[PDB]
Write an enzyme that holds these catalytic residues in place. Sequence first.
Site, mmCIF file in Angstrom:
data_model
loop_
_atom_site.group_PDB
_atom_site.id
_atom_site.type_symbol
_atom_site.label_atom_id
_atom_site.label_comp_id
_atom_site.label_asym_id
_atom_site.label_seq_id
_atom_site.Cartn_x
_atom_site.Cartn_y
_atom_site.Cartn_z
ATOM 1 N N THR A 80 -57.715 -59.694 24.252
ATOM 2 C CA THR A 80 -58.744 -60.540 23.654
ATOM 3 C C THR A 80 -58.191 -61.345 22.486
ATOM 4 O O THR A 80 -58.675 -62.445 22.195
ATOM 5 C CB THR A 80 -59.915 -59.676 23.194
ATOM 6 O OG1 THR A 80 -59.494 -58.844 22.107
ATOM 7 C CG2 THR A 80 -60.368 -58.781 24.326
ATOM 8 N N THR A 81 -57.166 -60.817 21.820
ATOM 9 C CA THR A 81 -56.626 -61.474 20.639
ATOM 10 C C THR A 81 -55.563 -62.500 20.997
ATOM 11 O O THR A 81 -55.224 -63.353 20.169
ATOM 12 C CB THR A 81 -56.022 -60.436 19.704
ATOM 13 O OG1 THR A 81 -54.859 -59.867 20.318
ATOM 14 C CG2 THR A 81 -57.003 -59.332 19.438
ATOM 15 N N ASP A 96 -59.828 -54.742 19.732
ATOM 16 C CA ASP A 96 -60.198 -56.093 20.121
ATOM 17 C C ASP A 96 -60.591 -56.873 18.878
ATOM 18 O O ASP A 96 -61.422 -56.415 18.087
ATOM 19 C CB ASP A 96 -61.341 -56.087 21.134
ATOM 20 C CG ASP A 96 -60.904 -55.602 22.499
ATOM 21 O OD1 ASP A 96 -59.718 -55.790 22.846
ATOM 22 O OD2 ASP A 96 -61.744 -55.036 23.225
ATOM 23 N N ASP A 148 -57.107 -47.025 28.391
ATOM 24 C CA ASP A 148 -56.221 -48.113 28.792
ATOM 25 C C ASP A 148 -56.028 -48.128 30.302
ATOM 26 O O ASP A 148 -55.991 -49.198 30.920
ATOM 27 C CB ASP A 148 -54.872 -47.972 28.089
ATOM 28 C CG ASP A 148 -54.031 -49.236 28.170
ATOM 29 O OD1 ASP A 148 -54.515 -50.268 28.682
ATOM 30 O OD2 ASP A 148 -52.865 -49.188 27.727
#
Lengths: 509, 513, 514
Positions: free
Chosen positions: C83-84, C50, C380
């Site tokens: 998030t990126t 993240d 994940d």
Amino acid sequence: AKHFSGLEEAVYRNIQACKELAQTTRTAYGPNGMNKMVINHLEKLFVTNDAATILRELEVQHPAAKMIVMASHMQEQEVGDGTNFVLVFAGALLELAEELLRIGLSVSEVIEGYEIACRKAHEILPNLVCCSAKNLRDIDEVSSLLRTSIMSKQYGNEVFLAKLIAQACVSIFPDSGHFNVDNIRVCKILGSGISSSSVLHGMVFKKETEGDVTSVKDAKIAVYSCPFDGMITETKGTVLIKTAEELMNFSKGEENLMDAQVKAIADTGANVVVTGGKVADMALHYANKYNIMLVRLNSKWDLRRLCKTVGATALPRLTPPVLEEMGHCDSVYLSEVGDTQVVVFKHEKEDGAISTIVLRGSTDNLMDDIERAVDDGVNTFKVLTRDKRLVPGGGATEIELAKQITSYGETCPGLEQYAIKKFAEAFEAIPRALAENSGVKANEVISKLYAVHQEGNKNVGLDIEAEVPAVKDMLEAGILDTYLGKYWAIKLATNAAVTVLRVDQIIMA
Amino acid sequence: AEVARAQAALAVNISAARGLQDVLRTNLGPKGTMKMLVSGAGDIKLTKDGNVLLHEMQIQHPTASLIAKVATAQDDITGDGTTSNVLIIGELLKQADLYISEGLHPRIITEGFEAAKEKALQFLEEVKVSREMDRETLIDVARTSLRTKVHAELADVLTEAVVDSILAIKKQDEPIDLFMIEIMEMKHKSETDTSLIRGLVLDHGARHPDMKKRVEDAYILTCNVSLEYEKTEVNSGFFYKSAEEREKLVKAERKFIEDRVKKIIELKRKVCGDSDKGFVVINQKGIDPFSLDALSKEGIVALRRAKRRNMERLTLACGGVALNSFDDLSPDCLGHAGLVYEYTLGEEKFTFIEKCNNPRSVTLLIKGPNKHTLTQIKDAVRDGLRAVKNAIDDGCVVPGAGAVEVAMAEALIKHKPSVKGRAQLGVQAFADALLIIPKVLAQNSGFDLQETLVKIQAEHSESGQLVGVDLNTGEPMVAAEVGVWDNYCVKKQLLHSCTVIATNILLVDEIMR
Amino acid sequence: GTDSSQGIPQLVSNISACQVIAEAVRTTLGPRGMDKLIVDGRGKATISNDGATILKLLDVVHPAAKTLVDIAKSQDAEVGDGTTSVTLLAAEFLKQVKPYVEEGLHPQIIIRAFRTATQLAVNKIKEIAVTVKKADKVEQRKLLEKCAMTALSSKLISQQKAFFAKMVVDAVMMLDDLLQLKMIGIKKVQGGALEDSQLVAGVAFKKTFSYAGFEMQPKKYHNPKIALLNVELELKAEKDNAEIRVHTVEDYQAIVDAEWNILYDKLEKIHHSGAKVVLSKLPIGDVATQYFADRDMFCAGRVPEEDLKRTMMACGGSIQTSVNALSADVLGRCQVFEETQIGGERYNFFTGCPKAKTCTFILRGGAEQFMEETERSLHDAIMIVRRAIKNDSVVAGGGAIEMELSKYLRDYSRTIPGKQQLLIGAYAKALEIIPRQLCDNAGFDATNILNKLRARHAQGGTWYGVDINNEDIADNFEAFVWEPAMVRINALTAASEAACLIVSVDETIKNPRS
């Protein structure tokens, strides 16, 4: 520094300060302005769309910049919004004079061309009033007029926020006509979105609140800036951390000493005790038992907003309070402010000076952004208690002025004549600003606002009618000005400009 | 050390003073400009005034030290024309430069300066006429004298205010004011607003819900250092020699608060009737709220936060006895004011003392919250109060605005100062330095400065009539019918100060550091 | 003084700085996407995925750098995945408007072009989205197996995914109404059931102290009373250090015993207040360890703090930093205590918890570095299935919608513009950069891969994207690659927002003069 030579202060310094005035209200103000990022001495990004906040934030060493800032301080004091209007109007009018200086005119010559013409424009200024209306009791009347006030410093919810600001100033003062100085203190609660902002009458301590009410019929206070870690009318105790056996003895005696404190405050008359500092644990255990109200950890600005409205100052120690340091409020009650439980007082016209609007949003800068728009609308209601005369929206007013002022210039003839021709051209900075706020060309908009000759209602907003530029009725749109609000805005801008035009070199010993 | 002994040593000296004059050439006129001045810590000040721009902040010049000395004596004797005295000597160096540029003695130029003044001092007797002590005569002088020193819109609001202040004397013979000078600044909505009220204004009034507001035949009890002590007119510390000595004082202090409000209220029953006549307490210091209850319920207008400067003019304003105590010394230790009234406007409460035994102290109530206005509108007051007082001290006022300058220069026609022509030298640079006041205005106006200046001379030679230069056009006009009249106390003193320093410059041909 | 610069040369300085900062978080996110390494401060080298983790860790050298942090923080707080991607798309807006604004073509209709194209996007995402919990089962737990087994087949494993997926499904169904990472945390040994993991429905303890006696203590209970302490227990209690003393004979044997009586008295304060198993973060003394063997009680010091946080939520207890307890609702308790040395490491298993909300995986791989990727393989499947439950409105993953939305909004660039095709075209240009980067962090030619998808987007279907495990074009619906609809809708409203912040602001004012 601060004093130079070489025809700088007259010709060169003034246009330089106008560049700082440039792009400060030229895309950041209109029917819809754009944000600018400022970082203060405390590290935080700040959005600004009001002129007076950013220029108070912006530090200048240029004394020529400092003049119009003081004029905008009056225009927040007298009008409110339109300090933005002061900048680009005075910023244009200063820049038009140096071409007259390249002709070879003197400074005081073109000053005189601005003095008789602002007298002339203030005589045209009653002739620009269109659709006067006023209802100091009708929220729907006021939310329509305060819409364009909060349009000028927002982009999002206008209809949600205009109903809130119209509700407060009417209902805080039901004797409107001699409306008070300030009657709204904001309550920035971070959290839930912009639709959770609402109006609460009376003081709101949105900080932490312990205990409960003592009486709801009275809400007398003894506001203290001092903690309650043993502070008493006698020798002031502290939390004994020097010895663990002294910590046990102080813990057993605190509730009995908290008993001496709460009876020293409540017998003189109080149901809520304001705590700026801390409360000790056993001191907090007794206040639940005595059922006295404590509100711990309020900020200095929170201390200031309380001490302004109740007339009671904070104290550095525990005592039986004097009469001059006790405040009275109508009621105190625990109700959810933004659907979260904090305490909220009651201040009628018997108490006055405050009706809170809670600021809630996922971003405090949004909460800082709506902080900008509400400050002008407070004074705008105070403007509205003065005049009922409505002027149409910004820029549509200036084009009717420019035609007669140009016709007035040739009737003068002199070298003040050419300044009056320039005096009509400072009017057109406002359609230059709204075209630059849209990011479109100005002279096409200037050519349109010339040709209409109804011209007193016609301008282009911050619209898709400004995508390809095309005029509209500002008066029908709901974008409004007023008589006195535009009057001081022209008066103070022309006042500071000819004085900052008149300036000479500086020497310093 | 190092020496500079040449004609270049004079040439550096005459160069510095001319350039400093051309900075001040922007000033001196209604068409002249205000000069922005910034302090070392920074403070915006817009003054056209000579002494304030000179004595406060300046740059490094040895001539700057010299011109500060002579503009002091102009400010000392008159207090006006501190703008006007600089412009003469700048030109006076300029034409005198040319003859030593040709090559002549500095002393043969010096000696013609003295005969230049003496031919003109006798002409000052001719050119002035006897004018009246009328208000409207002083209206024409005041609004003219303000515009040369400050702005014309500043002159218009003060023309009615300045003339009525100096008129309150009973033929007191003084060239400047002393007690009329009282400036009460006030945060207003209007930056430019001026209120002249007869009598002294108190800088801070006071209000209790039982305190009266309008009182007549107000017997003033002037008050000072406060209730906590007794029979004191100056403050004192506490005894720290013993631990009990600190405690025994402050336990008695609340009793003296009781005792001294008791003396005041019992004097109100004796002298003022029951409540039939007004009674006023003017405390220099803070009022305790217990006595704010006890005085105001008696019917006493008590007042808070006076200055000791206000105490001294209050002795003149009441004309009777202005005390500094609370206690009953004697009932005839009370000054009398037939009217004392506290009017509250803005944030501040202003108490007036009127029906004065001496119409010697008036006070201009000065509006404006912004300091740059509040400095400038205060600066227009002090030069205005002195200059018009020069006009009422003089039985004869000169008609000014440059009409004498062409009048003397034609009257200084040569071969009358003929001894070797060295007297013709110093009168000739003098006559050209006369004309700078017509040169500066038509520079600041249109009608190019020397093109119309010779047209003034062509008209003044016609029938000997005094013709001046317009302050707004630069056009020729008669100075008498228009009434552009300067102070003769300025004009008479102007010859003396400008002569002596340009003499002193020619005596300086060496400079050492 | 105060720093300030206005206009386009400041604004070009604004738009260029933010793109360079975005160059890290552009190029991240996945198994064929990326995984971090930085060094900050003392030399503390960390590894992340993240950006919003490390954007809090990396410095801010611009206001544009400060702009990216909260926008990344907003995406990390809701989902934790992607998030990126919001910080990707924001600066990608600025790249094609950069030739426009450097020509001088700079409207403030740029920002309303963001919001208008957002509304057309977020409506199209929602109207194409399918609720899968309602329509595509009535029990929807075997449904979640096929999504989790796909999430396990992505990172590392391809054969353990059938054995692990039901353990993922049975753990998440307990963690519903919660999203904690310390309540799904996975523990690691090699030496248990190798290449097999287990799911416990209670509280497991990784680092528990032994080698001071564990077979001298009862290692199991059937009503444990858990003392969640944080107090160091010493080898021996102390005496004073001033005027402390040995040799003479009278006060001699006592002070050696007086070091020992004070310790066990404090240990008895744990005992009669109610404790049969005692845990402490600070180390328990070795001679104090055998005193719990004297009262026949289990004890372990040197415990991580995150382990004690599991116990207080499932037992209803609390952590303590005292030597005496006053209630059993601050203390912990269960109904089965069992110590099991799996992989040679001492685990304390809490089964029969009063709530049993915490789930813990005891992972055995084939190695240690294999088990590192195996844990993040399992992690994940935990992140995506918890996200799949909270929003049934689910579209395909892999940026499959975006390439359709790229072509969808260029049709509006054909349709609407007065000048707006430059903006909406640039808006639609930045949309395909995310699966482009997802091909580019996978390394292969997106210009080959993305261009084949739009041909099958031209016929019909938006779920056409990339199966990155082979890097081929694939219908990510039928390739089981998913993510809920509001995730992109929260992403689009935040990526356009900071882009609206950059366009509106041309000046940065620093009042304390840096």
